[PDB]
Amino acid sequence: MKKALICIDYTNDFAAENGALTCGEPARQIEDTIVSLTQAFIENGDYVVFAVDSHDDDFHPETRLFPPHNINGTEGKELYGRLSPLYEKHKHAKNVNYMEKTRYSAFAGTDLELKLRERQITELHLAGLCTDICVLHTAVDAYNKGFQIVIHQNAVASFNPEGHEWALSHFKNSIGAQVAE
Amino acid sequence: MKKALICIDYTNDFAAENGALTCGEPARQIEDTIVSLTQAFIENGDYVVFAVDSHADDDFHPETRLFPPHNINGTEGKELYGRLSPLYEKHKHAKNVNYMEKTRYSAFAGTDLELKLRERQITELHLAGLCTDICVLHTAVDAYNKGFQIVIHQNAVASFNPEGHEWALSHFKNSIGAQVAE
Ligand SMILES: [Zn+2]
Ligand SMILES: [Zn+2]
C-alpha cells in the first residue's frame, strides 16, 4: 500500500549510557537496524516521521513521574548515534518530517494523522523506543484509526524484556499487526 | 473531584466457564469485588458506565475471522456475568447508570463516552473489568491522552494472561501515572 515509517523517540536520553531516562543496552543494540530501516524508507521516497518527545513546565503529566528528559535544546533530545547524521543529511527532504510530540503516542496533540491522510497513507511501520510504552500507545491510536500496522521487531526495544515480549504478542494477537523481522 | 466508574466487558463470554472467549477463573474470582465496587458507585450516586463489547457478520470489523463470535447481541454470552447482571437490572433505570455498547477494545473508541463524561464534568475515571492488558489497557491509553485522572481497581480487573495482567498494572502505575488501588 502507501507506506509511512514512524521512528519514535530514538534519542540520547532514551538510549545513551548516561541518557537521562535511558533504556540502556537493548536500546543501543538496535541502532544499526533502525538506521538502515529509516535510511531505506527515506531513499525509497516513503514518508518518514521522526516523532520525538519534546519537553520544555509543571503542567505536563510526566513531570510527576520522571526526571527531566528530552528537553528542547539539549543534547539528550538529539537523535542517538548514527541516526542523528542520517536525519541531518535528509532533514530538507519532502518525504521527511521532524515532529515534536508531548505524550507517548505519536498521534496525541500532533498533526500526524492530518499529514498521513493528506498522503493517503494506509500502512504504518513502527520503529523506536519503547516497545511497550510509546510504540504501544502509537499502535493503539493507529489501530483505532484504521491503519494497517507493521512492527519492526528488531527496530524496537524496551528496557523491560518482558514488556517487550508482551507488546510484540499484543501487536500480533490483539491489534492484528504484522510483526516483521 | 467528580468520579465515574467504567465497568468493562464483565460478560459471560469473557468470564464464564463455557464463555466464547473466557479468561477463566481469574475473571470469576473478581466477581465479589467488582460487584461491590459497582454497587458502591451506583448507590453513592456517582456515574457508572457498563461498557460492553457488541459485535460478527461484518467482514469489515477487524476482529471478525480473527476471533470467534463473542458478546454477540441477543446471545446470553453478552449478558453481564454473575451477580453483576441483577445489579444492573435493578439500577438500569437510574440516571447515573448507563449501558454503552462498544466496537473496539477501548471504551472511548467510536462511542459517546467522552461526551458523556464531559457533560457530567467527570475528572476522575475508575476502571474495572476484563481484560487488564486488552480492553482495560486501551481504555486507559485513551483516558490518559484525554487528560483524565485514572484509578485502576486491581482486584476488580483480570486477564487470561497473568504476565499481561502484571505488566499492565505496572504500566498503569508507572507510565500512565494512574493510582492502582487495592
Ligand atoms: Zn517525556
Ligand atoms: Zn470484541
Side-chain angles (χ1 to χ4, degrees), chain A residues 53 55 62 69:
Chain A
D53 192 26
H55 284 280
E62 282 176 27
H69 63 299

Side-chain angles (χ1 to χ4, degrees), chain B residues 4 6 8 16 23-24 59 62 78 119 129 137 163 175:
Chain B
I6 318 292
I8 303 168
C23 308
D59 286 287
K78 196 182 186 195
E119 289 173 356
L137 168 61
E163 291 88 30
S175 288

